[PDB]
């Protein structure tokens, strides 16, 4: 599993819990949606982009 489209619209807390069940060594970083980010590819990382309510606003994916 490398993408979690089912987490869009869920809380950041539930997204973290779910991603860590599937990928327990994931390095999760929470970022505001609508920011610009570095474009290196990190197989261990999952960025979670959240709206101002702290809900997931974009499909989480490994990288």
């Amino acid at each position: 599993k490398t993408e979690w489209p089912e987490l869009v619209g869920k809380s950041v807390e539930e997204a973290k819990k779910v991603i860590l069940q599937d990928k327990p060594a994931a390095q999760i970083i929470v970022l505001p949606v609508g920011t610009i980010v570095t474009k290196e590819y990190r197989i261990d990382r999952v960025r979670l982009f959240v709206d101002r309510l702290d809900n997931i606003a974009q499909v989480p994916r490994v990288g």
Partner: protein
């Protein structure tokens, strides 16, 4: 002893170096997380920070901007790695914080700083899935002003027939760069779409890291500075060539790979780009 990372050889930068051209007097802004100016294999000429809580552009709290800068311009000496354009005047334009993210206004402010400070080349190893009018206006202004603007295509892989190139790469004024490995195969993460322009090495790329270290990173972030460095080599051999001409020289001399949706025009070849007469190999 110095090592030449395979990607520097793969784009044919040593052919420019042997002609005597290494990017001297070309100003390249690395618009990124900063650049560690204490690294002995880098020479940072100047810069500025647009990150409100990190006012020093010469401290890189992430590592990414230092890695990207070493692909552009790691020094030609007896240590570390060799950059594509090892004599370039390298500018640290910090618009991303420690966590690798920045607000659109910070990126725009760095592009405006680069224009005001007469940068010849901008590298943006960065992106997001949405554009904005103000972002498009800043890149378009830099290009209208004569700057060669290079960006990572993104690491969003494929999504059927849909483009997955992010912004600012997706804007026509910006050269969007995808990632291949040492065998010229597209990296599985490399974004795709009709906006993909050219490819460059983006897998297991050795470069400079903060605190006098080196390491291998992956990403379209790593491919973009090969193209920004190639633009600096070309301008050092042809100092009057416009950004229009530098961009076309790179596009018109790639080694064609697969379908353009996946590979754009193919792998850049700076040797062929810096000749007067251009064709694909």
């Amino acid at each position: 002893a110095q090592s030449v990372p395979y990607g520097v050889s793969q784009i044919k930068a040593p052919a420019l170096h042997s002609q005597g051209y290494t990017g001297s007097n070309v100003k390249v802004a690395v618009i990124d997380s900063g650049i560690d100016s204490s690294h002995p294999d880098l020479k940072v000429a100047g810069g500025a920070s647009m990150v409100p809580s990190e006012t020093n552009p010469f401290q890189d709290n992430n590592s990414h901007g230092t890695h990207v800068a070493g692909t552009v311009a790691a020094l030609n000496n007896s240590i570390g790695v060799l950059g594509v354009a090892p004599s370039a005047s390298l500018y640290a334009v910090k618009v991303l914080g420690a966590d690798g993210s920045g607000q659109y206004s910070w990126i725009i402010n760095g592009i405006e700083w680069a224009i005001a400070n007469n940068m010849d080349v901008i590298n943006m190893s960065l992106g997001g899935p949405s554009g904005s009018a103000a972002l498009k206006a800043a890149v378009d202004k830099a290009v209208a002003s004569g700057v060669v603007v290079v960006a990572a295509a993104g690491n969003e892989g494929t999504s059927g027939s849909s483009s997955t190139v992010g912004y600012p790469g997706k804007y026509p004024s910006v050269i969007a760069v995808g990632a291949v490995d040492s065998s010229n195969q597209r990296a599985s993460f490399s974004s795709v779409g009709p906006e993909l322009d050219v490819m460059a090495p983006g897998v297991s790329i050795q470069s400079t890291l903060p605190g006098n270290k080196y390491g291998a990173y992956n990403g379209t972030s790593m491919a973009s500075p090969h193209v920004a460095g190639a633009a600096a080599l070309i301008l050092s051999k042809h100092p009057n060539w416009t950004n229009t001409q530098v961009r076309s020289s790179l596009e018109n001399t790639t080694t064609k790979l697969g379908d353009s949706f996946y590979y754009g025009k193919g792998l850049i070849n700076v040797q062929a780009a810096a000749q007067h007469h251009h064709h694909h190999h």
